[model samples]
Target: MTEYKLVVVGACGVGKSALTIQLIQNHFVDEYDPTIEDSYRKQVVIDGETCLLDILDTAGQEEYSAMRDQYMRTGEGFLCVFAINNTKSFEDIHHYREQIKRVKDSEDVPMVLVGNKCDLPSRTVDTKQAQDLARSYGIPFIETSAKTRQGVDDAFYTLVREIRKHKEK
Candidate 1:
């Protein structure tokens, strides 16, 4: 079976770990701060073909910039995640996108923009901006709630589909 090297990238406390954990184990965690380079895998069927999705939960923080660049180099596909409750985290997605493009040394890379924690009633993030941002990047934009397991599957599954789109890579 083919393997997809997936990495979750975004600002800290944005639920990067939670998103990956939910995707891998179908479980939600309240609060878990990770830094020790964690990895997970899930055998999933996409496009009617089962494949291994190897995920690396890489939280985005200026202090861990070096490690993030390391994962960017190895990541075949990425889910650039951020919390919808804050603006700075969404701003971090811009950095992650450009950072990946530079690290990959490609004009375009396989990735999806993820807006997580939508279950929160606070609507600080305007979906219009997210839509515009995603449109400009020409990537899929999905809002997910790892707590509810909503849109989580689409985020990863969309990345897999995007990976398939990057056949020439």
Candidate 2:
């Protein structure tokens, strides 16, 4: 079994937990549950490759930033997820990138930039900015919609494929 940790970081209300839960369980939070915390964990496997996705779902509130460092330690693959409709989330990608480098301390692995909540049009961030930032970092970027399941599977699988290639090299 191949183990890879995937971290999902974003500001609160940006849908970090929602995206993580959807990716892991293929189900959404059905109720207004009050027990929701700022972070959670889950695992996922694809194409016979077992990945222990230690999802670091974080709140947008920067107060949790200090505690969030620990989760980054285990991430072999980083998914800097942001909501499609939130410009703040988009701008926050730079911070996430820096954090990934600080934790992984290696550029050899794959770091995939993911723009989530693609289902909502009015709230989407600028595609140009996303593309430009992705180009600057030299990481693969794509839009994903957990609500509609668009690009959801491909988002994870593509990152896995990139990581697998790194292993082969």
Candidate 3:
């Protein structure tokens, strides 16, 4: 079976860990202590293909920046997440993307730009603006709600599909 290493990253409270846990466990936890970093493994079948997924759930703090290159270097694909309600989180995505490119040493690395916390009452980052940015980077952009389980699976599946396709190329 193919093994895929994917990293989930973003600013703190952007729901990176929540979304990762939701995808892996099919449930949401309303509260979680800030993670320094975490790893999860699962065997899943997608599109009739069996594969093993290794996900790195990263810490969303500046102190963790020193370790980011280590994670980015090993990731086969990435889920660059941000919160729609937090403009600062959204703005910081460019830095993550740049770091991924620099560490991976390639512009064609498989990735997906995710906007989390869609269940919130307010949104500071417009969907259109996020889409435009994703377009510019040639990556798929998706909005998800971990609490409601909206678009969560699609985000992971899409990244896996893109990674598979990129590998085939």
Candidate 4:
């Protein structure tokens, strides 16, 4: 059995919790609470072996910055999310990625850059910027929408697969 800690990081309202719900529960919250803080631990059979996951879905803001950084420290993999229509969230990627690099003590940890809210047509964050950042940081990038179930599974499953690959190596 393999155990991995995965953390989702991004500014508030970027759909971190929504992404968590989609991946873990396969459902969507039409009206989600903005002030919720939570963590979920589960074991899913991957490759016919039980793999443990401690998924820390953090609320990102100046107030929760410390706790968010703390969760990043202990995570084995990360899904760095940002809204497709929020430029500020996209800009904060450097800060979060830097924190991951410092706290996780590795530049090699598998990171998946997620541009969420793909179902929205009003866009501010460019796909090129997201792709460029993922390239610069050496990770995969995908546009997702928890609302429509687009790329939601890819964000988590790709990280899981990468983590499993690293474990095998």
Candidate 5:
């Protein structure tokens, strides 16, 4: 079975943990203690191929900023998330993507640019803008809601699929 290492990155309070928690627990987790790294494993079948997914839910705080490059270096794929309700989080994605590309030493590394908290009524970032940015980076883009479980699976699955495709090549 293929084993894939995936990492999640974004600004603080961008719902990175929430999205991972929802995926692993199958429910929303309202609170998260400050953490550096939390790992999760799940057996997922994508396109009729069973694979083991190892996920690293990373801290978004400034204290963990120094380790971001380290995480990016070891990850096979990444889900770079941002809260749709926060424009600053959206803007910060450029830094995350650039750092990941630099650390991975390839712009073709498998990744997804995710806009989380889509269920919120206070969304400030438009979908088109996010999609356009993803297009420019040549990466897939998805909007997800950990609260409603909307597009959550799609985001992860899409990344996993891309990871597999990249590995195949």
Candidate 6:
């Protein structure tokens, strides 16, 4: 069995908790209290192996910023999420990625670039721009919607692949 230690990072209100809960609980969630870290777990089968996904969802509150380094230091893989409708939120991932790399002390750590909230009617971040950014970083990019449950599984599963590849190296 493979157990993945994953963390979700992004600016406040990018629907980080919603996405994780959807994956674990199989439903959309709202109204998260952003003062503390949220830990989630789910057992899944991927590539013929039973895997445990342990996710640490960091809070978006500025007061909790000090705790970021703790999870950053321990996480094996990361889901750097951004909101499609919020350009500022998308930009925040750059800093999050940099911080993660610095904390992990590796430029080649396993990570997935996530553009979430694809169910929104309003659009800001373009598909090509995000894909291009992911290409530049040499990481997989995925769009997901916590509300509609689109591409949610692929985002986490893709990180599993990336993490396994990194471990092999």
List clashing residue pairs in candidate 2: 11-60, 12-59, 12-60, 84-125, 85-123, 85-124
Q: What would the per-residue lDDT of candidate 6 be over residues 60-167, giving only the tens digit for each residue?
A: 554565566777888999999999999999888889889889987988889999999999999999999999999999999999999999999999999999999989
The ten-residue window of minimal lDDT in model 5 covers 60-69
> What's the TM-score of each model vs. the native?
0.93, 0.79, 0.94, 0.87, 0.93, 0.94
Give the winner by TM-score: 1 or 3.
Answer: 3
Q: Which parts of model 3 have CA positions greater than 4 angstroms off?
A: 61-66
Q: For residues 1-169, write the lDDT of model 1, one tens digit per residue.
A: 9999998888888889999889888999987766645889889998899999999887445466776677888899989988999899998788888888998899878999999999999867888889999999999999999999999999999998999889755
Give lDDT tens digits, candidate 4, residues 77-165.
88999999999999998888887888777768888999999999999988997888889887899999999999986788788887777
The C-alpha local distance difference test score for the whole of candidate 3 amounts to 0.91
Overall local distance difference test of candidate 5? 0.89
Q: Could you tally the backbone clashes for each prediction? A: 0, 6, 0, 0, 0, 0
Residue pairs with backbone atoms closer than 3 Å in model 4 (clashes) = none
Q: Please give, for residues 1-169, the per-residue lDDT of candidate 3 as tens digits.
A: 8889999988989998899899899999888777657899989998999999999988855466657677888899999999999999999999999988999899899999999999998999999999999999999999999999999989999999999899887
1 or 2: which has the higher lDDT? 1
For model 1, what is the error of residue 34's alpha carbon versus the real structure, in angstroms, after optimal superposition?
A: 3.6
Work out candidate 1's RMSD over C-alphas. 1.9
Q: Which residue segments of model 4 deviate by more than 4 Å?
A: 45-50, 61-69
Cα misplacement distance, residue 94 of candidate 4 (Å): 0.7
lDDT score for residue 44 of model 4: 80
Local distance difference test values of all predictions, in order: 0.88, 0.70, 0.91, 0.83, 0.89, 0.90
**Model 1: runs farther than 4 Å from truth?**
61-67
